[PDB]
């Protein structure tokens, strides 16, 4: 199946305090592997997965220097952006940056990303061609002109299509027992009587990896979406995921309904029906 | 592995 590597950076100004907060995390697929937090005592990039600990001191030193370069860049950006939006020196503001790459089942480059947000909305993003920019508003055109002039896209492209994907492959290999595993969902259905007139059927998928999954309801083999609820896929805390989907049905009509479960660990999708 | 080149906005 497909895989991704992504880095997420959050930069929060703290006026009155105290230097801005800077948090960086890296992910391979749905598995976090490194962190850095400005407020932590180490001031180092830290391992957050067992397989990354195999990397020697050159790596940790290198990543620490680079994440501090990112921190410092973001330190300057908070001021620059406050200037672009004619904002006061006394209000907290949030900058986020995300970049990374996707590979297909043959582990070849599929797509690259590099986007930037300010105060909860898009600021500037690299387009899928990895050659042009989308600026979200008037202020971001300044940055767009700036980055076009400096060939920032070409620089990002070289990393995204090259270094990004090669390290992703390395991680996938080194942490294969974790990252290349498929844990098929453990499934079951529960039944709860709302009253004499209705019952809720809830279809569960537990202890699965990777997070990608689809849960759907049918009634008489027709897709059923009305009176249905689907929660966000959620972390179990042990490296696996959980999800459920529910439908409210008329009393006596439970057997019409089926839950359908699709997941990489399932050769064929599962079909579940209430078993009283 | 992180990008080493980061341009200011």
């Amino acid at each position: 199946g497909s895989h991704s590597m992504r880095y997420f950076f959050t930069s929060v100004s703290r006026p009155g305090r105290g230097e801005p907060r800077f948090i960086a995390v890296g992910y391979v697929d749905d598995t976090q592997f490194v962190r850095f937090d400005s407020d932590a005592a180490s001031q180092r990039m830290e391992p957050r997965a067992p397989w990354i600990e195999q990397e020697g001191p050159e790596y940790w030193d290198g990543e620490t220097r680079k994440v501090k370069a990112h921190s410092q860049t973001h330190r300057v950006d908070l001021g620059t952006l406050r200037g672009y939006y004619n904002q006061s020196e006394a209000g907290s503001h949030t900058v986020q940056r995300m970049y990374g790459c996707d590979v297909g089942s043959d582990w070849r480059f599929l797509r690259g990303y590099h986007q930037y947000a300010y105060d909860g909305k898009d600021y500037i993003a690299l387009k899928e061609d990895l050659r042009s920019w989308t600026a979200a508003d008037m202020a971001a055109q300044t940055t767009k002109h700036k980055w076009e002039a400096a060939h920032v896209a070409e620089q990002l492209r070289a990393y995204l299509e090259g270094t990004c994907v090669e390290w992703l492959r390395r991680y996938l290999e080194n942490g294969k027992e974790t990252l290349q595993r498929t844990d098929a969902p453990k499934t079951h259905m529960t039944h709860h009587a709302v009253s004499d007139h209705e019952a809720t059927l809830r279809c569960w998928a537990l202890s699965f990896y990777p997070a990608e999954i689809t849960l759907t309801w049918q009634r008489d083999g027709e897709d059923q979406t009305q009176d249905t609820e689907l929660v966000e896929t959620r972390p179990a805390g042990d490296g696996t995921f959980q999800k459920w989907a529910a439908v409210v049905v008329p009393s006596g009509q439970e057997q019409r309904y089926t839950c359908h479960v699709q997941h990489e660990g399932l050769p064929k999708p599962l079909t579940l029906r209430w078993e009283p | 592995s992180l990008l080493m080149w980061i341009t200011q906005v």
Partner: antibody, heavy 119, light 110 residues
């Protein structure tokens, strides 16, 4: 024991191209971020381009963007600079140089190869 | 251009000190703590002597010291000796590239 040895420098007409090579020996070349730095006769040092240890990710001075391409191959312990659209102002001694860690400053250097851009 | 500005020349008699300034902007010198200094003797490749603003490379005595304040880094050479005569260049990370200063010739008088 540690050595970087450049070659490929020579005379080329304005608008022309040249490829430089740098053969590394006596250190683990594959772990160093590599750069090209040039120095015009009687003039100061100018960083030209750099490439990460694994190859792929690169960076260039404004003065050479779109014209130069840096590359390496770790199996041959060699660094390359392909230079296109050459200008009289590209005339210089070109050094190959490396750093183990990012942002440290290059501490292993070659001896330079001379490029002359002239009609 | 983006250059890192240094003085053309500084000098001192043996035993004295010189200081060499290196000024950039928040894009570089003022933005990061990744300033280095190089010594280059005639007909030789540059040698790294200082990295990470203040850290001396192997073999470099404490009489060479680096610092910075705001947008300006400094190299001070105390206890000046004849063999200190050379060109000195500062250097900085600048986000999307590296950049050297314009270089300073150090003369040892007498």
């Amino acid at each position: 024991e540690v050595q970087l040895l450049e070659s490929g420098g020579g005379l080329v007409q304005p608008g022309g191209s040249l490829r430089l090579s740098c053969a590394a020996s006596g250190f683990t070349f594959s772990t160093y971020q590599m750069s090209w730095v040039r120095q015009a006769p009687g003039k100061g040092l100018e960083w030209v381009s750099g490439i990460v240890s694994s190859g792929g990710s690169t960076a260039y001075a404004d003065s050479v963007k779109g014209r130069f391409t840096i590359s390496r191959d770790n199996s041959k312990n060699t660094l390359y600079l392909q230079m296109n659209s050459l200008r009289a102002e590209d005339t210089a001694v070109y050094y190959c140089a490396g750093e183990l860690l990012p942002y440290y400053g290059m501490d292993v250097w070659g001896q330079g190869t001379t490029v002359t851009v002239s009609s | 251009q983006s250059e890192l500005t240094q003085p053309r020349s500084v000098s001192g008699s043996p035993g004295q000190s010189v200081t060499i300034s290196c000024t950039g902007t928040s894009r570089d010198v003022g933005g990061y703590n990744y300033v280095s200094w190089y010594q280059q003797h005639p007909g030789k490749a540059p040698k790294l002597i200082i990295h990470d603003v203040i850290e001396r490379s192997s073999g470099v005595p404490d009489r060479f010291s680096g610092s910075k304040s705001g947008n300006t880094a400094s190299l001070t050479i105390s206890g000046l000796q004849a063999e200190d005569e050379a060109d000195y260049y500062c250097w900085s990370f600048a986000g999307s590239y590296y950049v050297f200063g314009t270089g300073t010739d150090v003369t040892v008088l007498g």
